[PDB]
Design a protein around this motif. Structure first.
Motif, PDB file in Angstrom:
ATOM      1  N   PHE A   9      93.454 -13.584  69.408  1.00  0.00           N
ATOM      2  CA  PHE A   9      92.706 -12.351  69.600  1.00  0.00           C
ATOM      3  C   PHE A   9      91.220 -12.602  69.388  1.00  0.00           C
ATOM      4  CE2 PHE A   9      96.960 -11.047  68.265  1.00  0.00           C
ATOM      5  CZ  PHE A   9      97.290 -10.179  69.284  1.00  0.00           C
ATOM      6  N   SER A  10      90.398 -12.068  70.286  1.00  0.00           N
ATOM      7  CA  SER A  10      88.960 -12.240  70.179  1.00  0.00           C
ATOM      8  C   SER A  10      88.395 -11.377  69.055  1.00  0.00           C
ATOM      9  CB  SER A  10      88.278 -11.895  71.502  1.00  0.00           C
ATOM     10  OG  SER A  10      88.797 -10.693  72.043  1.00  0.00           O
ATOM     11  N   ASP A  11      87.194 -11.734  68.612  1.00  0.00           N
ATOM     12  CA  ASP A  11      86.505 -11.023  67.548  1.00  0.00           C
ATOM     13  C   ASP A  11      85.222 -10.395  68.077  1.00  0.00           C
ATOM     14  OD1 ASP A  11      85.036 -13.416  67.851  1.00  0.00           O
ATOM     15  OD2 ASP A  11      86.077 -14.321  66.148  1.00  0.00           O
ATOM     16  N   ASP A  12      84.761  -9.360  67.371  1.00  0.00           N
ATOM     17  CA  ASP A  12      83.568  -8.643  67.802  1.00  0.00           C
ATOM     18  C   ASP A  12      82.313  -9.497  67.673  1.00  0.00           C
ATOM     19  OD1 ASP A  12      85.270  -6.409  68.147  1.00  0.00           O
ATOM     20  OD2 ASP A  12      84.978  -5.835  66.049  1.00  0.00           O
ATOM     21  N   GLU A  13      82.297 -10.442  66.730  1.00  0.00           N
ATOM     22  CA  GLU A  13      81.113 -11.276  66.540  1.00  0.00           C
ATOM     23  C   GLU A  13      80.821 -12.110  67.781  1.00  0.00           C
ATOM     24  OE1 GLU A  13      81.330 -15.112  65.261  1.00  0.00           O
ATOM     25  OE2 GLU A  13      79.425 -14.951  66.337  1.00  0.00           O
ATOM     26  N   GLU A  51      86.335 -12.033  77.636  1.00  0.00           N
ATOM     27  CA  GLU A  51      86.479 -12.989  78.723  1.00  0.00           C
ATOM     28  C   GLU A  51      85.679 -14.247  78.410  1.00  0.00           C
ATOM     29  OE1 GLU A  51      87.518 -14.759  80.733  1.00  0.00           O
ATOM     30  OE2 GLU A  51      86.288 -15.210  82.474  1.00  0.00           O
ATOM     31  N   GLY A  52      86.288 -15.399  78.663  1.00  0.00           N
ATOM     32  CA  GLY A  52      85.743 -16.675  78.278  1.00  0.00           C
ATOM     33  C   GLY A  52      86.410 -17.288  77.066  1.00  0.00           C
ATOM     34  N   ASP A  53      87.081 -16.478  76.253  1.00  0.00           N
ATOM     35  CA  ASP A  53      87.896 -16.996  75.167  1.00  0.00           C
ATOM     36  C   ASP A  53      89.182 -17.575  75.733  1.00  0.00           C
ATOM     37  OD1 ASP A  53      86.215 -16.196  72.923  1.00  0.00           O
ATOM     38  OD2 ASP A  53      86.809 -14.140  73.403  1.00  0.00           O
TER      39      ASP A  53
END
Lengths: 54, 152
Positions: free
Chosen positions: B60-64, B69-71
């Motif tokens: 899961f991606s993080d807000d920082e 997209e790109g992860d």
């Protein structure tokens, strides 16, 4: 006891002195150990743990 | 695999739906791509019920780190097809579409295959009850003086 030499010993009478020592104790030497119920070792090892504690 | 990002999964889902691909003279808007990535994240979070659902290796991606997209999704090579087929099924209603029968069947098959090995792992037998004797046959138990199974 002391000891004096002479014939006249007026006002030279000594008293009595007895000394003493005191003996005491420290703190207990324990072997606190726990026994989890849900483990196979509970009866396999606790007896010999007691012996090693002794 | 050539599908190594969440945006790649979204693009594959759109290609499967027939909405946008490498050859189409028209393409989907980047806002639409971001919304589809959000839908994919929501679907994956719903699947992975905080560790009690479908285990897939999804990261899961993080807000920082700004761009989701790109992860790299982190999925294994065997889960990409299932993930993007279910993604196509989920994001079909945005464009007033309906995922076709073949895509729905492939999505169901992929979800089943995703949970197959996890179900095999979780199919585990409980230990002996707390009141079950060990019996006299177990000479180790008899000599160690534990006649009843621990349990729990």
């Amino acid at each position: 006891s002391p000891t004096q030499e002479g014939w006249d010993l007026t006002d030279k009478a000594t008293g009595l002195l007895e000394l003493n020592v005191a003996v005491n104790m420290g703190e207990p030497d324990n072997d606190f150990f726990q026994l989890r119920a849900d483990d196979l070792r509970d009866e396999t090892a606790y007896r010999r743990r007691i012996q090693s504690a002794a | 695999m050539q599908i190594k990002t969440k945006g790649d999964l979204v693009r594959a889902a759109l290609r499967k739906l027939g909405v946008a691909s490498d050859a189409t003279l028209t393409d989907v808007e980047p806002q639409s791509m971001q919304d589809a990535v959000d839908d994919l994240e929501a679907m994956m979070a719903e699947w992975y019920q905080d560790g009690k659902g479908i285990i897939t290796g999804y990261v899961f991606s993080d807000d920082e780190n700004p761009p989701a997209e790109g992860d790299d999704h982190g999925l294994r090579s065997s889960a990409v097809s299932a993930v993007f087929h279910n993604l196509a099924c989920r994001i079909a209603p945005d464009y007033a579409l309906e995922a076709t029968a073949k895509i729905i069947a492939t999505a169901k098959y992929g979800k089943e295959l995703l949970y197959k090995q996890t179900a095999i792992s979780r199919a585990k037998r409980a230990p002996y009850p707390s009141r079950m004797p060990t019996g006299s046959g177990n000479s180790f138990a008899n000599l160690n003086e534990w006649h009843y199974f621990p349990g729990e």
